[PDB]
């Protein structure tokens, strides 16, 4: 009867086209502002002093870029970790010079993605679902907050944060290799196993369902039209695909349970990306990966090279060349 | 010893944020009755509007 | 300096295959409206 109850009834209605919910009250204003500023800053945005040395790095399309090289540049080294909104900038020209829109996009992104995650919970509550799709979405939220939030914190500047682009991503990955040795760190190892394993069990499960489909169509029409939507009959012989994989490797390595099978597809990647995103986090605070340089010596004591020493000389090439003007002192403490 | 404390209590403090997500998803749904799954006799989606 | 044959590569790489996929959808809906026999078959 009241105005608030007629508003709570609408905002929590599943009869809307897109469910809004109470998290959409701060998902939609956040992500539309992260979007509408991203499209403008990617297309039309002046160059940005990223190294704090007043050498402005172009990143937008109107200043001679493309899809690959164009990128929303991170904020300045001069700012660093300080909060830099528009009203604390004394003009928009001073805001866009010092890496303004990187903080406006990222902070409205991480609020909107952490609200998109809670929105996946909310609709599962109002639909009668068991709730935990949003726990599986915690794994890219852990990884998005690792390279945009946690790594600028432990390194003390948003300038070490990830550039919102495509070539800026590979500037981020290579400089992160030289300074932290991520490939030898066992948490990037535990998530390469998460996505190689994840793409394995995806294409391994998706093939054994498509292999054991039941005849419901003719050879002229499509294979997919043998599934009517909302039917109650099972659309594939699960005993058939169990007997196949029960002979392809051996018998006891096969899940006859389809529920425990469809749980292992959700376990393996998500655990692999939780562990990986806490690799960037523990390497944000300079707890680097393994270092086996000069580890094998002869009885005389001369250093015998290994593959890690060849990997070290690739890291030394990126270390002596990243931010080639920003350094003045012999050790990259930042 | 700073890098051991900032990388281990930080390490745990994300997984306990995941513990807030697991244990409250179950507890809010155990209070409502559907933590064991959807009822076959009464599905809530079928008693809704057309989908659009 | 960019290659001026790339405009012809991209804008025909967009339009010619994308206008192809539109045609397979329009004749799909015409056959469904063709059999249905009401107000649109003719």
């Amino acid at each position: 009867v009241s105005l608030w109850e007629r508003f709570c009834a609408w905002i929590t209605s599943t009869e809307n086209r897109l469910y809004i919910g109470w998290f959409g009250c701060l998902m939609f204003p956040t992500l539309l502002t992260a979007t509408s500023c991203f499209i403008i800053a990617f297309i039309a945005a002046p160059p940005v002093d990223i190294d704090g040395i007043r050498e402005p790095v172009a990143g937008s399309l109107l200043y001679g870029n493309n899809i690959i090289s164009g990128a929303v540049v991170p904020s300045s080294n001069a700012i660093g970790m300080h909060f830099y909104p528009i009203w604390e900038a004394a003009s928009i020209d001073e805001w866009l010079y010092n890496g303004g829109p990187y903080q406006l996009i990222v902070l409205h992104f991480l609020l909107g993605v952490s609200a998109y995650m809670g929105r996946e919970w909310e609709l599962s509550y109002r639909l009668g679902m068991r709730p935990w799709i949003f726990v599986a979405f915690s794994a890219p939220v852990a990884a998005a907050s690792a390279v945009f939030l946690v790594y600028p914190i432990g390194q003390g500047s948003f300038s070490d944060g990830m550039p919102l682009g495509i070539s800026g991503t590979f500037n981020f990955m290579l400089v992160f290799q030289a300074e932290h040795n991520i490939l030898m760190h066992p948490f990037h190892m535990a998530g390469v196993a998460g996505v190689f394993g994840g793409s394995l069990f995806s294409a391994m499960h998706g093939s054994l369902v498509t292999s054991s489909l039941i005849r419901e169509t003719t050879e002229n029409e499509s294979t997919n039209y043998g599934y009517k939507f909302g039917q109650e009959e099972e659309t594939y012989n699960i005993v058939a695909a169990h007997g196949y994989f029960g002979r392809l490797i051996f018998q006891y390595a096969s899940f006859n349970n389809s529920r425990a099978l469809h749980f292992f597809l959700a376990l393996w990647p998500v655990v692999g990306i939780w562990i990986t995103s806490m690799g960037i986090s523990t390497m944000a605070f300079n707890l680097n990966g393994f270092n086996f340089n000069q580890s094998v010596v002869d009885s005389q004591g001369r250093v015998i090279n290994t593959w890690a020493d060849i990997l070290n000389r690739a890291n030394l090439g990126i270390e002596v060349m990243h931010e080639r003007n920003a350094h003045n002192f012999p050790l990259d403490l930042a | 010893p700073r890098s051991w404390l900032c990388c281990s209590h930080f390490f745990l403090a994300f997984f306990f944020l995941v513990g807030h997500w697991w244990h409250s998803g179950r507890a809010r749904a155990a209070a409502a009755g559907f933590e064991k799954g959807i009822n076959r006799a009464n599905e809530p989606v079928l008693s809704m509007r057309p989908i659009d | 300096e960019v290659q001026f044959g790339a405009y012809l590569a991209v804008l025909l790489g967009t339009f010619l295959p994308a206008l192809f996929l539109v045609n397979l959808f329009i004749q799909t809906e015409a056959r469904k409206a063709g059999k249905a026999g009401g107000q649109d078959s003719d």
Partner: peptide
Amino acid sequence: MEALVYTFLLIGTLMVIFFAVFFRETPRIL
């Protein structure tokens, strides 16, 4: 002149995302 093509590809991609969400073929039981 060159960046005009890149912008048209980007907003043209966001058009077909808009039509796929709102003008989707709504699936129906029976």
